[PDB]
Amino acid sequence: PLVVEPSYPDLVINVGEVTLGEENRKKLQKIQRDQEKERVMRAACALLNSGGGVIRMAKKVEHPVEMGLDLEQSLRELIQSSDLQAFFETKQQGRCFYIFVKSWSSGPFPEDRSVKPRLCSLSSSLYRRSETSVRSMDSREAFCFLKTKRKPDPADLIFQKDYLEYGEILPFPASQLVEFKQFSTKHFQEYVKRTIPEYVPAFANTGGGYLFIGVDDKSREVLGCAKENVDPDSLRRKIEQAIYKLPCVHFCQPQRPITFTLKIVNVLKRGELYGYACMIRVNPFCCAVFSEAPNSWIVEDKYVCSLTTEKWVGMMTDVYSKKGLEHKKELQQLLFSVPPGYLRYTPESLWRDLISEHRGLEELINKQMQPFFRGILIFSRSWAVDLNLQEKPGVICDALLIAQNSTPILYTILREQDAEGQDYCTRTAFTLKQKLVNMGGYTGKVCVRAKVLCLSPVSPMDYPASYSLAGTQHMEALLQSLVIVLLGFRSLLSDQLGCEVLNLLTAQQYEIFSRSLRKNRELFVHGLPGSGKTIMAMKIMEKIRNVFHCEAHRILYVCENQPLRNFISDRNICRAETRKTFLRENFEHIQHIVIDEAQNFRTEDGDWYGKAKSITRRAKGGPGILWIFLDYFQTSHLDCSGLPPLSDQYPREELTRIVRNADPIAKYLQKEMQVIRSNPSFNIPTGCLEVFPEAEWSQGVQGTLRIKKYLTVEQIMTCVADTCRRFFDRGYSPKDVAVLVSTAKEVEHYKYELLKAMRKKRVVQLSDACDMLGDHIVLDSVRRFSGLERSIVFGIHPRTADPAILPNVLICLASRAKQHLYIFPWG
Amino acid sequence: PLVVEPSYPDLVINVGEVTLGEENRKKLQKIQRDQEKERVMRAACALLNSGGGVIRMAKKVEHPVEMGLDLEQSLRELIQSSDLQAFFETKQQGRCFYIFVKSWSSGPFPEDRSVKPRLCSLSSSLYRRSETSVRSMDSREAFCFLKTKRKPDPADLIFQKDYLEYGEILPFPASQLVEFKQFSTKHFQEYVKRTIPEYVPAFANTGGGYLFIGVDDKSREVLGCAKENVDPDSLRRKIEQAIYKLPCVHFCQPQRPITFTLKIVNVLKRGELYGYACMIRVNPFCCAVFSEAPNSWIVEDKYVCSLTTEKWVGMMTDVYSKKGLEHKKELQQLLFSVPPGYLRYTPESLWRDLISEHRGLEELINKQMQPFFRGILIFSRSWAVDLNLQEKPGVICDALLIAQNSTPILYTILREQDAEGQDYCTRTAFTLKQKLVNMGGYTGKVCVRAKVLCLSPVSPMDYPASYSLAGTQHMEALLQSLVIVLLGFRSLLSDQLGCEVLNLLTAQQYEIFSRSLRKNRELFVHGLPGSGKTIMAMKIMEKIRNVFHCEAHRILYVCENQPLRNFISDRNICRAETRKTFLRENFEHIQHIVIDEAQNFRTEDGDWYGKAKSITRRAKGGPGILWIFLDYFQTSHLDCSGLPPLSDQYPREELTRIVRNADPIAKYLQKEMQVIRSNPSFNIPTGCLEVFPEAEWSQGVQGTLRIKKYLTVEQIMTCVADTCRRFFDRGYSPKDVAVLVSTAKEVEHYKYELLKAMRKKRVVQLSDACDMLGDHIVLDSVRRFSGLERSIVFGIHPRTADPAILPNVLICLASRAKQHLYIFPWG
Ligand SMILES: [Zn+2]
Ligand SMILES: [Zn+2]
């Protein structure tokens, strides 16, 4: 049988010795030629249905030879096209002949999912009647026939007649519903065994028909067989067994077997019995009937196996990221933008830490990359872990080189030479190559070379020139399929791609939301937690400045918390001030006012709502823009916020899509929002909390949410330090971690405890919530962290003075984490 | 040549005598069999590419026979499928054999434009190299190849040699880029003339290659030719002549011809010259290269003609109503809904008039329809005129029957027997059948029978049972294609479908607009003329009642005009009152107020806006709905309307989409809206008229716009009376005509004069805009007709006291007409 060779970064199938050349193949016996051709097509079909590979055959001659007319025609039938170069390319070195097979269908959601079949097969074993002949359906015809089946006569008069005279002339000829089969007495029982699978499936697949046994094809005469040889009882059961043996695949309820009518009649010659004749009426079948199992092959594990009949049908008719597939062009342009003229190392943060940690790594990488003048080099601490494989101790880093005029190469750097070094790099290159095809949906020709380098001071195949990345279009298309592959795993670039999907999802909701600037002057935006309410507020001011043609300092941003005010002031898009400064300082020069987290405002310091209305109403261009952003789920106090009653909060805009948190984070928010609705606060208006998110909305970005309880303060602090070190070891930046506590009075106590456990991790410096641009871990209270967002958030002991607000601190906490969240509740 | 015979309601091609039956067809010589097969395939290809038809052949035998294996295989290659029944079905009666060919591609915008090719061809004459063999591209392969082309070596060393030793062995074998050809000296000149056509386009279509003449294929030995026969100088001329004769179709600029390198080298034997060898290098071609003209046929006029190379490429690579195709399912249910259990006559208005004028027509039609128990019978005064054909005097009516278990039949009822009557019905049935396929996009098997009935007291071809409408699915799918056919012409059913498309376009814009009820309480809707501003006002009040669960009388509708108030009050959806009644009566029990055409209000009676706010704000559910609908393009006075300044008119919804007027009417409005912007009224605010329609919005509904000037007052009336009579003759109801004059004081003058000329047309009854339910022609002033709409509108002598308002009456008048408008301006 055919087995896959495991010492290569591809699917290599060795078929043994194959005679090549039409002159050499003609001299062979038909049986041997058929066996060799069948083995070659088995390998080719397996590689077409398994994502591509190489077919290795050893030829009996030294000089170059052609593959052969029969093999070429069989491959053409396999791919149903004369474009034989687009899938198969041949090379030969010495006594070995190679055929490099491309993948037929690439990706789980191909662009031609509803057009071309998923499987290539030698024969589908689906016969249907075509006028006076029985023909087999190829892959496209079988696909169309199964699609059709998936959705929800003069011959009768002879059939009812009970006896037939010898030599009777049948008026009707052979046609779509009538077949005349000559019945021979020498192999009469063998003849019945073989003719049933050929014609019964043909009629049942197309409207049914009649099958006459014992009637000459040309002369249409009734002859039958010898009455001595034929046993009508023994003959009847064999036909019944043969018809019931045919495999049938049902797409409907019920699933009754094949319905047919068998009639055995006496043949009379000169008024004397001469023999028996067989009439078969096959009723049309509600589904497909197979003459035998389909001849389609696929590679599972290290073996080549044939697909079962029910498994073949399922593939013909029928973590994956939906968001990554549609945004793959913009995601690639952000992270993996190919640079013209020089070779770029990504990530730059991880590359810098690698060269400083290991001496000589910078010079080793540069010496190997001299021949390459353009491309991108993607670094990682272990590319096997990024592909859910096992890490090999002693590997410094893995690099995937995607350069022009060169096939992709996966470099593995070892700090000392190891016997398993080449085996580890080969398995990761082979795994990455298969994912780029079967998961990233790459429709081109791709091969990943496995190269091993050592820091301290089997042969690869020579792929055809069409496997090399010729220009920008091929490298860009290959990188876009790597984005889909990366988004399905957990790694450094999986999260950096996951972060950019959230920014693309938020920009989609903003475009719908940004249309309200021309229609409204005073607007009350009721956003939901994690819906990007703060992000739109920043985006509108960029649009307000352009639309109204006012300078930046005319727009005023008012918030409740000091740390968020600093964030807005850093971007220089407006003047950002706290509520207290808004009431105290005079703002007669302000034209437009944007208010954020209005539910957290307080009225004891003054009447902020009236003053904001007065300033905007008295603008030069009539009424100015006064957009009030608020979310009643994140109310931080039980006092009166000074807002008008819910009836007067019009016109109103609603943000219901959660577009700033990962999938497990979003599910946590929606589950927690249900608890808030069941126990509304007394100060909160009754009808405001009746807001529901989108019925079926998924961010398509995977994250992490772990709850660890019954841990002491010392025990919690080590877990935070260990998790941060694990993230920083993989290459994350320290500016992606935020630690949030219940109250601002406990910030100083937890800060000393955090440094005590984190001093062992080579970082002893933290930043406050007031400084977000610093490359330090932010440790501050949840309430003072409102309006900000971080990639990794650790919540330590969520607590508040009033148990009524206790359900509200969690939702104000989980909404601050974009991808990773770790909560350590009270014991 | 093959010519279609014009005596049937289909494309019938007579191919003459054809031998049928495999036993009979085996006995013929290859030449005669090939000629017969090629004739049959020409007919089949013509009918496949021409919309379907019948192939008539006269067989030489009486008993039923099969068509033959070779013909079946040729048809299978023609349709590229073994499903030979879905396109060809055979019938035989006596000495004639019929093949009923279905259309390959139906409609100008099929569902498979990018999936299946448009043309069926015997051969595309496109050859491409397939490994070591040259293969011709089928229709699908040629389609894919042209789609790809439309988007914007050891053999070299031997080529550089200047002489070749006799018997030299070429190291390389024949491959994708190398071809070895033996050169025969007996017919050496004629050999070259035919070798170039099939091999040079093969290389040029796929990356190019090398062509060697004079080398043995099997042994790779260089032989050349004899010196006495081959002349190197003259041999070059024909080779470059033959390569330049290949037709080439370019998709790009520039269009340089095929580029190749020719070298003729001496063949030396034992150091002595023996002959010449020809080496050809073919550079890859930027576009497709044809060995000869494609073998595709089509029926044009009364002949069967072959498509030229330039035309064949265009069809394979590349009035029609786009809106009709989208809404064909909804349009069918409104008009042509098949009734289960009885036969329905449409239109009912035309059916009633037909039986009244002509005695015995009801008895004749009912007698003919007895066998049919289900379906729809579509009546018309002349179906030929509906299809842009010529009217035949003496025809009472034409009826198209679409019934269950019966092919469509077009009945032509004649007052008296006429010899031409059968020709008239056959030509209309043939035209209607082709429109249903080539224009309506019907992908099934359709035949339209032509039957002639006479009120006063060639054989019909028997189509197969697959042409009969078996059930509701086939009848429904056939009528949806008739909807698209009708919408492309000008007729009664074309206009009734045009009115329903406008009602579906308005319902599309309402769904977008209806989302503002949840977000707004006070709203200022700035609509454009013809945008359906009044229609949304009625639809909103039905949504307000459902959403707020209030009783119907709780909603108040306020309008300036009395005729508009009457129309709204008749629908029993709210309380409709005039502005004057609003200020006079007390409405303390009203919760929601909807104001329409607010730009026509006046302050001479009091503050209507102030009273509106007080009633709505004091509602039980806080602030009630107060939506103000206005259109500044249709202001009927220069006084103050009482609306707040343009700066205080917020929030806003803008209806910019013209969805209530046909295409000619809509283009007239936008042209006139430009004049209004070029000179706004002084009372009109500065920035309100800056509302623009969509950049590219088309209704896709045909209409009529005719402007006749310099006619006297008497001449206007007879034109209106004649136009009304011709419309009523076709079956248009009188309630579709409105006559609009400039001022209400001239209404009585024009009413008397219109009746003077219209009395000759058997209609004397006129009505005012206060009553629109009556089946009468409405005649009032333009300003009095605000808010209402009619299908046919006649504008007579537009005029106003102030020339500033002069452009305002035309835009207000034109917006009243939905499909037909006739303007008679002052001379
Ligand atoms: Zn079934
Ligand atoms: Zn070109």
Numbering used by the authors:
A (entry chain A), B (entry chain B): 7 to 158, 188 to 353, 381 to 519, 530 to 899
Kindly provide excerpts from the paper associated with this entry:
We recorded datasets of SLFN11wt and SLFN11E209A and 2D classifications yielded classes of monomeric as well as C2 symmetric dimeric SLFN11. Furthermore, monomeric and dimeric SLFN11E209A were reconstructed from two different datasets, resulting in maps with global resolutions of 4.0 Å and 3.25 Å, respectively. In the apoenzyme structure additional density for a metal ion appears at the proposed nuclease active site which is coordinated by residues E209 and E214. Density for a metal ion could not be observed in the cryo-EM map of mutant SLFN11E209A. Mutation of the ion coordinating residues (E209A, E214A) abolished the nuclease activity completely. The active site residues E209, E214 and K216 are essential for catalysis.
